[PDB]
Amino acid sequence: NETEDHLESLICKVGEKSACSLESNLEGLAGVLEADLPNYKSKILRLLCTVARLLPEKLTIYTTLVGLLNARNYNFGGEFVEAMIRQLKESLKANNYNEAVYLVRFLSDLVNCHVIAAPSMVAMFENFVSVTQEEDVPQVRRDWYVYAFLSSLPWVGKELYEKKDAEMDRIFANTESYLKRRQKTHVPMLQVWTADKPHPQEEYLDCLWAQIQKLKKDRWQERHILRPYLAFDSILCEALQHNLPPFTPPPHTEDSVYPMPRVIFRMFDYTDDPEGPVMPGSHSVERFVIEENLHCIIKSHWKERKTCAAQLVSYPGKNKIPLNYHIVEVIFAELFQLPAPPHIDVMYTTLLIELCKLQPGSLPQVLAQATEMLYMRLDTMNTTCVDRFINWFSHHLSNFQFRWSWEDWSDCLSQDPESPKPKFVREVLEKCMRLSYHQRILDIVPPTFSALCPVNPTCIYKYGDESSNSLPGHSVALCLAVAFKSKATNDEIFSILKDVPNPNSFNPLKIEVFVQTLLHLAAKSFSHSFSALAKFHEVFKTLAESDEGKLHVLRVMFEVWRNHPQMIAVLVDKMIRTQIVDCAAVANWIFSSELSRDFTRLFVWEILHSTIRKMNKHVLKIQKELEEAKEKLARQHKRRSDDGVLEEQIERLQEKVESAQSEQKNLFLVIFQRFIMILTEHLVRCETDGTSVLTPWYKNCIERLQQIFLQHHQIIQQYMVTLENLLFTAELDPHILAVFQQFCALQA
Amino acid sequence: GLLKALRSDSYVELSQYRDQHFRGDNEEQEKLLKKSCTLYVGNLSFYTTEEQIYELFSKSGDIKKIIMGLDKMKKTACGFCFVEYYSRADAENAMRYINGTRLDDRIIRTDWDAGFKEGRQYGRGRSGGQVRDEYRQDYDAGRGGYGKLAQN
Amino acid sequence: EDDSELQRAWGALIKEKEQSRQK
Ligand SMILES: C[n+]1cn([C@@H]2O[C@H](COP(=O)(O)OP(=O)(O)OP(=O)(O)OC[C@H]3O[C@@H](n4cnc5c(=O)[nH]c(N)nc54)[C@H](O)[C@@H]3O)[C@@H](O)[C@H]2O)c2nc(N)[nH]c(=O)c21
C-alpha cells in the first residue's frame, strides 16, 4: 500500500510548478520508475494508463515520460503500447468516448517521443477515416472518428506528414470528402447566437477542419503546445520505435451511444485586447488547443473551486496569450453550451467569483467587458442561454452588492418592452429582487429604469373589505376566514363550504373561495403556506378530485399570487409533491389562457422544468427500488440454492414503475401537443393576416420547445416513435417540424 | 484505478464542529453525517427572510424543507437556518458552491448536519441568541448590533 | 478570508464607468 500511494503521488507530481526545470523532474521521475521497474511493472503500466486517461491537460509531459522509459526499456514501451490499445478498446466498448479521444491523443503524441513508429499510426488514422465509408451507420460515430483524427493532428501532424506525406494526403482527401457531404441540420438547435456577426457559431468539425487546414498551410509550425521531449532530442532519438497492431474499430452495435455534436462558442477577438498578447485567431489551432486544455482543467478540478481557479490562472503555454479572456470565454462556453452545461451553473458563477478574487486587477474588467458584449448580442441569443445569462448575472450582482452601471444599458428603455434586451433587464431585476427585497432593487436602478422594476409581491384577495358584496361567495369567504382564525377542522370547513350556490361534483366557486381564503390567510411566509396547505390537504383532495378541479385550483392560486412568481413556483412544487395536482394539470395550466400574458416570463418555464424534473426523479426512484428488490431476490435465491410474498412485491413494483413511465409519457405528450397547438395557431394567424412570423413571442415559444427537447433528449429518445407517428408528422407545419428534425439529427 | 488528486474534495469534508446536545457517541454522529442531506447555514442576517434563502439554495438543487433559526424566547430570526435537500448530491453541491457566497451582503457559512430534531431551531445561547452572538463583541448591524455581553 | 480588495476593485470599476458616461 505504501509503495502504491508513494508511486501514485510521485507520478502525479510531475507538471506542477516547481523550482527545478520540468526536464530535470521528468528525468528524475523516469529514473525512479526504472529503478523500481521489476517489482511493479503492472502497477506502473496501470498508473500511466489511468494518468493518460484522466489528465489530458498534462498530456505532453506524461508522453515524454513514457518515451524516457522507452529509451531505456524496449519491453516496457511495447507492454505500455499494448496496454494503451487495450484500454482504448475497453473505453470504446464502454460507450464512453472522451476518454477514447484523450487516449488517441496520447498515442499520437507518443509518436513524437519515438515510442510508436509513424507508419503504424498513419495506418491507424487511415482506418479511423475509412470508418466514414461505412454504410447504414449514424453520422455521430463518423463525426467522432474524424474528430479524434483531427484533434490528434495538432500534436503529431508534423511527424506524420514528414514520414508518410502521400498517405496523409490521401487521408486528408477522404476527410474532406466526408466533411463536404455532412448534415448540418443540428446546428441551429445548438448555436448560442444565430447572428453571423461578429463571430459565427460554426460547427465544431467545420471549425477544426479550418484550423487544421490553416496549420497545414503554415507548414505545421505551431506556437503553443509544450514539447518537453524536444529538450531530450538526443536521449529519445536513439530509442527503438514500437509498431502498433492493426487496429479495427469496434463494430457498430445498437447499444452504442456516441457523443453529440457541439457548436464552438466564439465571443472574443484579438481587437478586444489591444494591450496584451495577441489573441490567437478563431481559425487557428492554437485557439482550439487553449480551449480544450482549459475545458479539461475545469473538468478535472470541477469539484474544488479554489483549486480550479488556481489551475486555470496558472495555465502554461509556449507563447504568451491573453489568458484572462480565454478563461472567461471558455467558462461562458461551458455555461452556455447546449443541450446542457458540463457541470452545474452555480459552479460556473462561483468559479468566476473565485477567479476574480485571485486576479482582482485584470479579470474584473474582462468580466465587465464580457457582460457588456453578451448584452449587446442579446438580439439573437438562445432563450436557454438567455436564462442562464440572467441567472449568472443576478448571482454576480447579488455577490457584489447589486452594483452595475445600468445607464450604459439605457438603450433598452426606448425600444419595445418585449424585446430581448429590455426583457433581459426586467428578468435580471426580478431575480435580483428574488435575492433581496423589492425596495432594495428600486434604490439601485437609476430612476429612469423604474418602468422595468419588478412589481411588489403582494397577495390579491378578491374578498377584501373594500371588495363589493355583489361577487358571489362573500359571506362564505368571511365564514371561512373566521373559521381559519379559530383553528378549524376539515369537517367543519366542509360544513361551512356546504352552502355555496353552485353555478353549474366539481364546483368552481367552492374551490375559488376556499383557495383564495387559505392563501390570503397564509400570505406571510412560505412556511405558513406550507403548513396551511398540508393541514387542509384533505379538503384539497376532495375539491380537486377531477382534472377541472386541479386546473381551477392552479388558476385561483395564480390569481391570488401573480406579483410573487417565486410563491407561485413554490406552491406548485408543494401541490405536486402532496399530489393535490398532477403534473398534467400543471402542464395544462402553463398553456392556459390565464398565463398568456406571462407565457414569456422565466418563472413559468422554471415551473414547467421543475415539474418535469420531479416526474423524472419519481420514475428513477421507483426504478431504483424495483432494481434493489430484484437484486435482493436474486441474492436470496442464489444463497438458498447454494446450500412467495417477495414475488408479489416485485410484481407490484413492476406495476408501479409501468404506471410511472406511462405518466411521464403522458406529460411529455401533453407538453408537445400544447406547444404544437400554440405554434400552429400563431403561424395560421400570421399567414391569414399577412404579417411577419418572426416576433419575440414566436422566438420565445420555439426556443422553449427547443429547450424541452434539449434538456430531456435522454428521455424523449424513448418516445421518438410515438412522437414521429402522432405529433410530428409530414402534415405538420415545417417551422414546428424543424425543431423535431433537429432533435432527430442531434443523435443520428 | 482513479487518481486520488482528482477525487479530492476539500469543500465537502466534515468540519471539526460536533453537536453538543446529541444523545449518542461520535461514531453514530459520523454515520448520520455521512448520509445526511441537511445543511446548517450560518452567518445570516436577522433580516434575511426565508424566500431569499430558498432562492439561493434552490439554485443548487431541489429543496425538501427550510427551517429558520428562531430565538429561544422572543421567537424571532436569529441568523441561522437549516436547508434540507432531497438527495445528498444537491447538498454536496450546495456545500461546494453556495458555501462562501454572499446572501444579503454577508458571507454565508454552510456546514453538514445530523438532521433536524425538534428544539434544534433555537439558539443555545443563554440570552436567547446564538452562542457566537453572545460571545462576539464587534458591532454587526445585520446581527442586531453589539454582542449580548456588551449591553448585559 | 475577506475579499474586500475585490469589492473595492469592482466599486472603482463601476465608478469609473459611471464617470466616463457622465463626461
Ligand atoms: C455553529 N453551528 C451551530 N449549529 C447549530 O445551530 C443551533 C444553535 O447553535 P448556536 O448558535 O446556539 O450555538 P451552538 O452550536 O449550539 O453552540 P456552539 O457555538 O457550538 O458552542 C461553542 C462552545 O465553545 C464555548 N466558547 C468558549 N469561548 C468561546 C468564544 O470565545 N466564542 C464562542 N463562540 N464560543 C466560545 C461556547 O460557550 C460553547 O461552550 C444548534 O443546532 C447548533 O448545533 C451548527 N450546526 C452545524 N451542523 N454546524 C455548525 O457549525 C453549527
Side-chain angles (χ1 to χ4, degrees), chain A residues 235-300:
Chain A
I235 312 182
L236 288 183
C237 205
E238 57 209 44
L240 204 66
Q241 314 185 335
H242 289 288
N243 256 332
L244 279 193
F247 164 92
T248 200
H252 176 69
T253 169
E254 273 230 323
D255 320 61
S256 73
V257 85
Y258 310 97
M260 283 183 358
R262 56 207 103 91
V263 163
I264 310 305
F265 175 80
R266 199 62 72 225
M267 97 153 181
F268 267 123
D269 193 17
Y270 76 102
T271 178
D272 293 9
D273 187 357
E275 151 208 281
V278 202
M279 191 161 345
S282 203
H283 286 297
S284 177
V285 72
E286 286 67 89
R287 189 77 155 269
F288 163 78
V289 169
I290 287 167
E291 303 248 351
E292 182 45 3
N293 282 193
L294 292 165
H295 281 297
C296 291
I297 285 177
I298 276 169
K299 166 162 62 90
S300 286

Side-chain angles (χ1 to χ4, degrees), chain B residues 67-133:
Chain B
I67 312 186
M68 200 69 24
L70 308 171
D71 189 324
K72 190 47 136 303
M73 304 142 199
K74 288 174 281 332
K75 302 284 157 103
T76 82
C78 197
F80 79 90
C81 90
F82 297 89
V83 194
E84 188 182 324
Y85 282 88
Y86 282 124
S87 56
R88 179 74 136 84
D90 314 338
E92 287 196 15
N93 279 335
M95 264 277 263
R96 284 189 253 249
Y97 309 130
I98 301 295
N99 185 333
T101 293
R102 317 193 92 117
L103 175 81
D104 222 325
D105 289 345
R106 301 193 60 80
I107 308 265
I108 262 53
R109 153 149 149 146
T110 293
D111 197 272
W112 285 117
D113 218 12
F116 165 70
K117 295 150 136 163
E118 241 301 11
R120 271 201 70 163
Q121 61 222 258
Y122 308 126
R124 263 62 158 291
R126 77 137 290 271
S127 152
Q130 278 202 284
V131 177
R132 52 167 287 176
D133 292 344

Side-chain angles (χ1 to χ4, degrees), chain A residues 433-454 456-706:
Chain A
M433 175 195 97
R434 214 169 280 201
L435 294 129
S436 215
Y437 45 110
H438 176 246
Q439 182 70 273
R440 164 60 104 98
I441 267 34
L442 281 189
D443 284 318
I444 75 182
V445 301
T448 326
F449 271 77
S450 75
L452 305 160
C453 276
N456 205 17
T458 47
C459 34
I460 301 163
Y461 193 7
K462 258 167 44 137
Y463 306 120
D465 56 356
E466 289 179 350
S467 189
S468 330
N469 308 344
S470 39
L471 293 181
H474 201 351
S475 40
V476 174
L478 278 155
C479 291
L480 289 173
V482 286
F484 280 123
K485 264 154 290 306
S486 146
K487 295 180 178 180
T489 89
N490 302 307
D491 269 321
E492 95 198 19
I493 282 281
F494 274 156
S495 81
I496 165 62
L497 269 186
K498 183 177 179 180
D499 291 346
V500 198
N502 40 25
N504 297 23
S505 40
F506 146 80
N507 211 56
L509 200 60
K510 211 189 279 191
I511 300 172
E512 164 161 318
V513 179
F514 175 55
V515 179
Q516 291 256 10
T517 319
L518 212 170
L519 297 183
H520 165 241
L521 267 71
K524 167 66 223 203
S525 156
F526 291 9
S527 92
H528 294 177
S529 270
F530 296 171
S531 99
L533 270 190
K535 178 148 88 88
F536 289 89
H537 167 200
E538 158 62 300
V539 198
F540 273 104
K541 294 240 71 193
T542 288
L543 302 170
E545 185 162 286
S546 72
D547 310 61
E548 306 92 296
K550 327 217 197 186
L551 287 172
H552 207 94
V553 164
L554 293 167
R555 152 156 63 266
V556 169
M557 167 267 302
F558 178 65
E559 289 167 19
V560 170
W561 285 112
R562 56 188 333 160
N563 311 137
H564 201 187
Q566 175 152 257
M567 188 73 105
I568 291 161
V570 160
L571 287 195
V572 165
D573 155 20
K574 208 55 47 163
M575 290 198 213
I576 281 191
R577 308 234 181 232
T578 297
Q579 308 204 131
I580 304 185
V581 304
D582 305 355
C583 297
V586 161
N588 283 355
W589 166 66
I590 293 282
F591 300 87
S592 89
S593 327
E594 284 68 89
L595 264 85
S596 65
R597 315 298 92 168
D598 308 13
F599 192 76
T600 83
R601 322 250 311 261
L602 174 57
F603 81 95
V604 158
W605 303 111
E606 307 243 329
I607 288 164
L608 186 53
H609 302 146
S610 194
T611 66
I612 294 168
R613 254 137 50 206
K614 273 175 247 297
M615 175 72 21
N616 295 350
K617 291 179 180 179
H618 183 229
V619 174
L620 284 177
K621 135 167 171 164
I622 276 303
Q623 268 183 356
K624 153 152 290 305
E625 262 79 332
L626 176 64
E627 160 147 326
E628 273 325 305
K630 190 172 178 180
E631 193 271 356
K632 85 110 181 203
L633 168 62
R635 172 208 65 73
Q636 164 272 352
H637 156 275
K638 183 178 179 180
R639 91 87 182 160
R640 291 210 66 192
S641 41
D642 289 345
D643 313 299
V645 79
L646 177 54
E647 195 168 3
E648 209 285 330
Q649 296 163 336
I650 284 277
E651 161 267 1
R652 297 250 154 281
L653 290 174
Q654 168 81 16
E655 221 64 9
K656 290 179 178 176
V657 86
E658 209 77 80
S659 142
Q661 311 229 103
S662 190
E663 232 180 52
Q664 204 179 42
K665 236 214 187 178
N666 262 29
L667 168 54
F668 275 103
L669 295 174
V670 152
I671 283 170
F672 294 152
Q673 229 151 43
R674 304 298 261 105
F675 260 118
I676 269 67
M677 206 186 336
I678 215 174
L679 292 171
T680 192
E681 217 74 14
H682 182 193
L683 293 175
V684 154
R685 149 182 335 138
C686 276
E687 175 56 289
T688 183
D689 284 351
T691 165
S692 171
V693 51
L694 297 173
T695 63
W697 182 100
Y698 178 87
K699 160 158 172 310
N700 299 316
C701 201
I702 215 56
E703 305 258 342
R704 293 295 172 171
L705 185 61
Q706 283 182 358

Side-chain angles (χ1 to χ4, degrees), chain A residues 29-138:
Chain A
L29 177 63
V32 163
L33 295 174
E34 185 193 32
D36 305 291
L37 201 74
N39 221 78
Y40 298 117
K41 186 77 54 44
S42 98
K43 176 54 156 182
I44 294 169
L45 292 186
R46 229 188 56 250
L47 284 187
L48 281 165
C49 284
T50 184
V51 152
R53 216 183 57 257
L54 297 175
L55 285 165
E57 61 260 23
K58 289 189 173 22
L59 178 64
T60 48
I61 301 181
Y62 293 120
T63 318
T64 308
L65 183 87
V66 165
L68 291 171
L69 285 149
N70 186 57
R72 304 216 252 283
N73 315 60
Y74 187 81
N75 289 17
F76 178 98
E79 251 189 353
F80 178 77
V81 153
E82 302 243 344
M84 209 66 33
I85 263 54
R86 204 134 38 67
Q87 179 62 203
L88 171 57
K89 289 241 192 49
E90 195 135 44
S91 273
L92 292 190
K93 304 153 28 182
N95 269 3
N96 81 18
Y97 277 90
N98 308 7
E99 314 207 327
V101 165
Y102 303 144
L103 295 184
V104 162
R105 269 177 220 162
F106 191 99
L107 291 168
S108 50
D109 202 20
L110 279 177
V111 157
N112 302 341
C113 315
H114 300 263
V115 176
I116 302 178
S120 68
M121 171 84 74
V122 161
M124 188 206 153
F125 284 144
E126 169 269 302
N127 292 301
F128 268 41
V129 161
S130 156
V131 152
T132 68
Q133 325 263 45
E134 295 176 6
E135 274 324 306
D136 198 29
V137 158

Side-chain angles (χ1 to χ4, degrees), chain A residues 8 12 46 50-51 53-55 300 302-306 344 346-347 350 391 395 399 401 431 434 440 526-527 566 570 573-574 577 613 617, chain B residues 1-4 6-11 50-52 54-56 59-60 62-64 86 90 93 95-102 104-105:
Chain A
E8 186 236 68
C12 279
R46 229 188 56 250
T50 184
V51 152
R53 216 183 57 257
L54 297 175
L55 285 165
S300 286
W302 82 266
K303 283 165 166 17
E304 299 126 331
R305 63 178 177 241
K306 272 152 175 167
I344 207 167
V346 59
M347 189 257 269
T350 316
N391 285 267
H395 211 171
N399 271 282
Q401 294 135 51
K431 250 59 175 50
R434 214 169 280 201
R440 164 60 104 98
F526 291 9
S527 92
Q566 175 152 257
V570 160
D573 155 20
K574 208 55 47 163
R577 308 234 181 232
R613 254 137 50 206
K617 291 179 180 179
Chain B
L2 330 174
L3 295 174
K4 321 315 303 168
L6 298 201
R7 284 273 313 293
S8 100
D9 44 10
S10 46
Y11 255 104
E50 166 153 343
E51 300 98 326
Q52 321 170 187
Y54 204 98
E55 181 63 13
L56 179 56
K59 162 178 306 312
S60 146
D62 280 351
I63 288 176
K64 183 157 151 308
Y86 282 124
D90 314 338
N93 279 335
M95 264 277 263
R96 284 189 253 249
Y97 309 130
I98 301 295
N99 185 333
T101 293
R102 317 193 92 117
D104 222 325
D105 289 345

